[PDB]
Design a binder for this molecule. Sequence first.
Ligand SMILES: [Cl-]
Ligand SMILES: [Cl-]
Ligand SMILES: [Cl-]
Ligand SMILES: [Cl-]
Ligand SMILES: [Mn+2]
Ligand SMILES: [Mn+2]
Ligand SMILES: [Mn+2]
Ligand SMILES: [Mn+2]
Ligand SMILES: [Mn+2]
Ligand SMILES: [Mn+2]
Ligand SMILES: [Mn+2]
Ligand SMILES: [Mn+2]
Lengths: 386, 386, 386, 386
Amino acid sequence: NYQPTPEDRFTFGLWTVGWQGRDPFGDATRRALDPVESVRRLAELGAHGVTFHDDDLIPFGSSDSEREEHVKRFRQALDDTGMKVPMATTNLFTHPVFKDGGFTANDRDVRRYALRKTIRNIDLAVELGAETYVAWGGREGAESGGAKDVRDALDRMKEAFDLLGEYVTSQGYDIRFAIEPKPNEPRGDILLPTVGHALAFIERLERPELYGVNPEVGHEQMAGLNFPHGIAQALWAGKLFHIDLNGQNGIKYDQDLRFGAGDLRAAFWLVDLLESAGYSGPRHFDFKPPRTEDFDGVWASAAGCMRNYLILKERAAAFRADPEVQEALRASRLDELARPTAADGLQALLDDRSAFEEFDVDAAAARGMAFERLDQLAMDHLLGAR
Amino acid sequence: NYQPTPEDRFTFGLWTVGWQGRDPFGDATRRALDPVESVRRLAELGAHGVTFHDDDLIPFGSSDSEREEHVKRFRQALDDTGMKVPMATTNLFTHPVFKDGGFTANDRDVRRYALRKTIRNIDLAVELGAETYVAWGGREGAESGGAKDVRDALDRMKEAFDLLGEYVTSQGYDIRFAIEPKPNEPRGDILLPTVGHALAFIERLERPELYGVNPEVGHEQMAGLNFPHGIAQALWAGKLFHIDLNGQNGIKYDQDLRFGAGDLRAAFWLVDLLESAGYSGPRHFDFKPPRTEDFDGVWASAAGCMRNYLILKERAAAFRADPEVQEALRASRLDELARPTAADGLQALLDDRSAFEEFDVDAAAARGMAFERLDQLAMDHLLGAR
Amino acid sequence: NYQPTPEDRFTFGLWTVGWQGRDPFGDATRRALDPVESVRRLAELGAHGVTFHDDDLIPFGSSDSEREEHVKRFRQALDDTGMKVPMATTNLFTHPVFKDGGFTANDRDVRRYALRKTIRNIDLAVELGAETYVAWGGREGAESGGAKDVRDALDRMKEAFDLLGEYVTSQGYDIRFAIEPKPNEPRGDILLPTVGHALAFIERLERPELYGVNPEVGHEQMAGLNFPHGIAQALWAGKLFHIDLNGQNGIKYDQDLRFGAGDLRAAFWLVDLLESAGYSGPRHFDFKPPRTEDFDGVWASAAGCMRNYLILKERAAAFRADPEVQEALRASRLDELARPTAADGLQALLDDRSAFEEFDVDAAAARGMAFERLDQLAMDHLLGAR
Amino acid sequence: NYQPTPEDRFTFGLWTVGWQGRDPFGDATRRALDPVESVRRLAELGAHGVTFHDDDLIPFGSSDSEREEHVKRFRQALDDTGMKVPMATTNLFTHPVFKDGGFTANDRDVRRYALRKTIRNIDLAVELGAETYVAWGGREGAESGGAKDVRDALDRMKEAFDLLGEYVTSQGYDIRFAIEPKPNEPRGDILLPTVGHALAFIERLERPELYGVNPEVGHEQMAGLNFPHGIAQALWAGKLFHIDLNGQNGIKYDQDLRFGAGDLRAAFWLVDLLESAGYSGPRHFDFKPPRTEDFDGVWASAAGCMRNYLILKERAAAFRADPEVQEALRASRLDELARPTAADGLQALLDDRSAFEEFDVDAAAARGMAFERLDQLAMDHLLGAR
Ligand SMILES: [Cl-]
Ligand SMILES: [Cl-]
Ligand SMILES: [Cl-]
Ligand SMILES: [Cl-]
Ligand SMILES: [Mn+2]
Ligand SMILES: [Mn+2]
Ligand SMILES: [Mn+2]
Ligand SMILES: [Mn+2]
Ligand SMILES: [Mn+2]
Ligand SMILES: [Mn+2]
Ligand SMILES: [Mn+2]
Ligand SMILES: [Mn+2]
């Protein structure tokens, strides 16, 4: 059991299972994959769809006729399998020209080229039916303080995203943008390093309604942050347009382990939250089968992503549906948390002696929150030890 | 030299130099300080002002006549010294009643009390002439996933800050709020953990213009983030209402070292940025003289805060004024970074073959950024080795 | 099920369930516990024993007759319950006198007093039948570079532990020492910050056979290290004299969550390793029920420690006993890892053309390690989803 | 001024200035350097010598006649410049064959090949006159718990280093080994992750006198550890055979910034310690000019390494020579720290009522350590603000 169906809306980047295993200290351990083969293998595993960087689908420098042929072949594999392309993105990090950034490169000519490169792939994403266009500004940032005036850079980042929003509007496209934060790597510090920074930035754009976030499990964890908390704030803001699922073991390089690996309990609380909130977007895995693996290991790792989600979905749902858990939630006053503090209004609060003059703070203080009992119920449910 | 004047607008919390040295593993190493004595000693050192939590100035549980006497004495020390009170805040973390939070406590009665406690001290802050009212929600958060629905909690946080904004408006007060992020400690994860999260949250409040951030050097660093970058985004947003200066050595407990200790180069880039941006608010130190110290060490540590700022101010200004640095900034294209990418507009960008069709990416790529030469000029300036 | 028995050798410090909830930002949330009550409650939960700091059992400053009475009462609770005292330790961190350390305090008189304090409690530990005497040098370290010459300090640390070893030898005691590393907190950096540093240090003592390590889950994790790896090296060295079990969520302050909380998968691999290696010492919990909790929460949290160990023990054993797992381990060549590289000796290795001249590196490289399939089997076993 | 001379014994790896700028997200930004050119440029900058991996000097797969020619040319550049080769090492991480390790690869045939590869380059290192042979087991470790039995792996690591020690002994070579710890990257966790673990491991080898450590600034910092403390323990053990100098900004990927960048104050305390201890080995930089740079930036960055050391050497020496600093060190009792705790012996300590019975702990406690005043003197000296 825990067999995925395309109805689970599990998606994978071409660059995930297609990662050849090059890391900063070693050569490739696997040959390149034909995107057509990935589409087929992923479909067989129960995937709903795939995603791509322009340069994953179409090799850098391709001529227009090479371009069409790559696209034609990919389109046939999609038609052959029933697979979808719900999201696409631009590679503004691999080519040396982007060594100081794309949209916030100090060189003006590079920023212009980065926008043109982007715009080109948005048209293709729309043609393949993508609803979301991701941006991961991996090269936007610095290793040293003087190299990047961040206020100027944010000015340039806003300029770029506003122009993209003008473009999609002018073309009548329904696609929306999702900004993917990362705190560092490959730059020493990257701009908009967390969900928070991305969310705040978007509120300064000309048409904020066109932009949301694409948070990645591992990236927030690289800042030691609580990824379920960040997702909750994103949901609260109405800005969870897409998500990247994977695993990460602490504050270190971006590991991109399969989903469920890494911080297992955070994975549980994440699935709990996504299902509870009714998140309806793709369940996208941005991961890398470890370079220790051969192609059988690649597909095993991809299957594991999906499996682990489905297992965690079952355990979270059983947790929430358990009457003993519902009673614990009441004992911990989660029901009170959801009630307004002062629907009676400011003046009635000021006039309420039960809120200050006659508040027994010592009796309130004495009330245990019973959070450990609640958390052991969650643990027992996660491990199937009820 | 590097003698501070009250015109430098250096301020200190009563709780900084007054910290008795209790930590989670040890008892107090210093006696409590009378706020009157701190005002006097700080004034002698060249401080401009002091700040306070309600419970620092007035002991918890004080009767109204004890309250007035505490206030009267403090007011006399201010009058005696010419010291100001530019900021104040509420203690919503020490009393056991706040063990699950103030504004986002699961218990509704506690949330109400937290608002009343806050409102009371805002009136006093206004009387003492404070322009900024800080909120550090140190207890807002969780140790376990089930204990806190973060969407409900953010609903309650918004409710609380909106009511405070309604209150100050109804009283015609000119004071503004500054939210102070911290990613963890004392809660396992704290809500609005970074400048980003705080900035984004504020855009959801009813009158966002009333709220900014009070970022703390050490807190952002506890998330491994670049504090000068975060300050830049805060400035970019127009939301740097206040700042907390101190030192931190990496991702660990909140150390609250004196300013300049910790990450020395980040301190330099921070001062560079504050002075360059014309930040005009207090230069506030939220720090703790290490508990190894006696009272002479306390005042030495406080003096060091101010000294280090002034030294770093001198070095940053010399860096920026150096013609050789100005030429390096041009060689690294910082001048281009400040120019709009495409003031010519979207269509002209789309029509510009120099931006794509005829862009020589390999020539662009070949251009070194010369950032290391620039950074060694900054290093030489910092260390006075030019 | 997953009911502990005293035969599981689960032990708890008096200071764990007795922690009143004081943290650096808040007052106590629970009253002090009588050690007699803790012994009784723990026994009821299935604990095997308790541990203590001198100052937990006997209040600082107690007179000899107060001392005897405290001891007499404790001894009656042990007799009443069948509970044991397998380990004890000294408090060289709470009293202000230890603000710069115990054994490595800059003040010579303090170092002498720290040794006398220690020696006194070793005699009591022996009387109560302890086999292990722990040392956690929480105050040994620095916040600044000039304050502590580390070579001099290590000289003093060696001097102290050698004198303790001379003492126990001179008294014919069979007790052994276990050094407990912590990388920071409460000092900015603490000496012997990891298992590694402790292990290396011990090899410089006069009678190294008398000293091992007492690693703590959360402490190594505070350095972002892999606690199962560290335990393995400790076991490899023959130096795992004791262990502290708890949970920690990343690189931050010492959280001391209940065992199984924090990094759940690391807890699984840890239990796997302890059981597989035949670790026969106490399963000791150094934890803190969160200060959100009342006394019912304290005992629930303590029960959870034990429960989670037993659940993880069952899953690890089923993993290792699973024939499909045994085949995967062979496919991943774990059997080869356990074979000597070159039992044939150096010259035969040099003479073996299969090892270099005629080694097909490309064929070797092409062999996938099949580690992901193995790890998903471990995941399925952990979550009971086989 | 701050002009290096070859007498400063500054050395650089061929792979540092020769790094082409490939990172996990981007292609090379600089062409490959001929080792002959690096030798020449480095010599011009004031370098004393260079170091190499076998595969840096001789391309993988080179035939014996290609080998000789590469070596001949390199030897001519050394002769031409007066440059030395004090250290060499083996590349056991780049080739896919090493994807699960060299000495601790699960595959036995790979471990054998890794030893042969190593032995071959030791003979060449000796011929070029190297005194130290470094080992960085970057691939030794795991991403998942079941993939690597660490006790078996350490057995294999010991086997490998013992065989290497047998080899150099059998050849009468005077070269010594230096193990270079790294906590993670490229493996999820790496074996012997810190100086501590390496030091402890060495004490289990057959001829421990042949092995020391080669600690790297950035690597220890990747574990949030205090690199000057670790170096002190290495020196204390007599095991600082070599060192790698660079910069790192916190717990993240291995940045390999130029020395002095990163944690500037740690760089100061490090230089203070090396000079104070009389470290006489190479001052080796294992760094990477950021990929933003062209070749002029590469040489600027390399020059900066040397400059920053010399500036920090001058400031540390002035700190220590300052009579006001010497008085502060006495006020902080650093002189007492260096005195034995109890040269009078155990019995006299037990008999000394001044050490316990009549020790005034409250008076001792009341004595401030004056560490902040001392640290601001160090700060003033570092910044040239005395
Ligand atoms: Cl913003
Ligand atoms: Cl928000
Ligand atoms: Cl050692
Ligand atoms: Cl060892
Ligand atoms: Mn990632
Ligand atoms: Mn991603
Ligand atoms: Mn702080
Ligand atoms: Mn603060
Ligand atoms: Mn702990
Ligand atoms: Mn412990
Ligand atoms: Mn490195
Ligand atoms: Mn190195």
